[PDB]
Amino acid sequence: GGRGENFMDIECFMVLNPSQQLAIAVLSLTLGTFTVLENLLVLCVILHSRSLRCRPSYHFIGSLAVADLLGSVIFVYSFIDFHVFHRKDSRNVFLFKLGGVTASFTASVGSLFLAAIDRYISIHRPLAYKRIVTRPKAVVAFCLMWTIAIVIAVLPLLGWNCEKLQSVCSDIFPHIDKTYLMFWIGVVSVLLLFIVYAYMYILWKAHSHAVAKALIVYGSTTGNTEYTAETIARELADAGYEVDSRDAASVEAGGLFEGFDLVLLGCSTWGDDSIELQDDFIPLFDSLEETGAQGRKVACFGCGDSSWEYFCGAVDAIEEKLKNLGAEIVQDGLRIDGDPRAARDDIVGWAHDVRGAIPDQARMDIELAKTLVLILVVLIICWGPLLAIMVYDVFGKMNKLIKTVFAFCSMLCLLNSTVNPIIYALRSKDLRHAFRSMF
Ligand SMILES: Cc1cc2nc3c(=O)[nH]c(=O)nc-3n(C[C@H](O)[C@H](O)[C@H](O)COP(=O)(O)O)c2cc1C
């Protein structure tokens, strides 16, 4: 060529111009540069803090984030190198760009593979897991994995080709050998098929010991016990519980506590002359034996005022019935005098003591399993469609329609690298603190 065989030179069927050309250009460039910076931000907090670069779990995030960065950098580079300067790509300069993107996804799948192995060791060798998967072990596994990932990108650059082999070309990518894609597609397809199976088994094994779901049922008229429950809700949410907070007026007692292994009942006391539970709680209290409390871990809280004869008599009545039902009361009830906002240190302190009802390792294994499946599903949603396009290319021919959706499916591949740093921020509670360490 000619017009040039250039990276990001797609068929570009244009419904509207030049607003599309102008607006999509700025939009796509801004999206790309945002990714490079936000994945550069993830790379920073990890290398910056020692409490994380010694963890084997952050050798997994850092690997993903530098894979996301390798691709987002190639995106912005090739976008500004062609849509702004209109420069031409030779054979090697083209394959290097494409190989970089290919390497970014390879290492991403390779990282999810190593994570599955770590979880398999945690499942099969829970006792000695800490001494098996160590910082020097994790570095070697990831360094090896990247060299295997890089090698595949360079293989096309180096040997496999249309030009060098005079082989059948790919209808999507210039210079690319069709039989190389079969090898590439098959390798990642097998790995992903295993990772999908593994991540399901990992998550299933993580629920065999414990689920990490807390239930909070509160009865409140003024809102003091609602504020108390919402405060307890966020402390348990940070500590790795899937917290479900419900007003007593909206629940049915039958089988209420099923599926939860921590249940926190809160109720205010309204003894005008006697002792009475908050009215929305009474229906639950009267049918409490239907909830499934026997053997379950529970604890009570409630707002009251000491100038009444029976200070927080409601939590007394609930705890006594929970004892009579064979519930496992984890600790003594929280009794808040006066305004709960003026006693927040106790509410948070109590929630911290209740937190230990389920061991840290069980909750941590569940959020690790939950986090991995989210990374995986996002990766299948974004990169999946593009892979399906490449499958259409190798076996049979393309279609005019598949060449058009490819322009938008390839943009899905980019926003996978943008939401992964967002996923790390929402689930890795330690990364948030390391971030705030640098203000
Ligand atoms: C009519 C009335 C009766 C009350 N009786 C008691 C009581 O017997 N024992 C107690 O500890 N507090 C009693 N209180 C105080 C409430 O429990 C207190 O106002 C509580 O903070 C309100 O809870 P809530 O806003 O979450 O519904 C009573 C308050 C009122 C207005």
Curated annotation (Swiss-Prot):
The keyword Zinc does not apply. Induction: Up-regulated by endocannabinoid anandamide. It is found in: Cell membrane; Membrane raft; Mitochondrion outer membrane; Cell projection, Axon. It is a multi-pass membrane protein. Keywords: Cell membrane, Cell projection, G-protein coupled receptor, Glycoprotein, Lipoprotein, Membrane, Mitochondrion, Mitochondrion outer membrane, Neurodegeneration, Obesity, Palmitate, Phosphoprotein, Receptor, Synapse, Transducer, Transmembrane, Transmembrane helix. Widely expressed, with highest levels in fetal and adult brain. Expression levels of isoform 2 and isoform 3 are much lower than those of isoform 1. One of its GO terms (biological process) is G protein-coupled receptor signaling pathway, coupled to cyclic nucleotide second messenger. GO terms for molecular function: cannabinoid receptor activity; G protein-coupled receptor activity; identical protein binding. The chain crosses the membrane at residues 22-47, 60-80, 93-117, 138-160, 179-204, 372-392, 405-426. GO terms for cellular component: actin cytoskeleton; cytoplasm; GABA-ergic synapse; glutamatergic synapse; growth cone; membrane raft; mitochondrial outer membrane; plasma membrane. It comes from the Eukaryota. Residues 48-59, 118-137 are cytoplasmic. Hemopressin, a peptide derived from hemoglobin subunit alpha (HBA1 and/or HBA2), acts as an antagonist peptide: hemopressin-binding efficiently blocks cannabinoid receptor CNR1 and subsequent signaling. Residues 81-92, 161-178, 393-404 are extracellular. Interacts (via C-terminus) with CNRIP1; this interaction attenuates constitutive, but not agonist-dependent, inhibition of voltage-gated Ca(2+) channels in neurons. Associates with G protein alpha subunits, including G(i) alpha-1/GNAI1, G(i) alpha-3/GNAI3 and G(o)-alpha/GNAO1; palmitoylation is important for interaction with GNAI3 and GNAO1. It is linked to Obesity: A condition characterized by an increase of body weight beyond the limitation of skeletal and physical requirements, as the result of excessive accumulation of body fat. Dysfunction of the endogenous cannabinoid system including CNR1 has been implicated in the pathogenesis of a number of central nervous system disorders, including Huntington disease, Parkinson disease, and Alzheimer disease. In post-mortem brains from Huntington disease patients, a progressive CNR1 loss has been observed in the caudate nucleus, putamen, and substantia nigra pars reticulata, and altered expression and abnormal endocannabinoid levels precede motor symptoms in a disease mouse model. G-protein coupled receptor for endogenous cannabinoids (eCBs), including N-arachidonoylethanolamide (also called anandamide or AEA) and 2-arachidonoylglycerol (2-AG), as well as phytocannabinoids, such as delta(9)-tetrahydrocannabinol (THC). Mediates many cannabinoid-induced effects, acting, among others, on food intake, memory loss, gastrointestinal motility, catalepsy, ambulatory activity, anxiety, chronic pain. Signaling typically involves reduction in cyclic AMP. Belongs to the G-protein coupled receptor 1 family. High-fat diet also increases the hepatic levels of CNR1 ligand anandamide, but not that of 2-arachidonoylglycerol. This is Cannabinoid receptor 1.
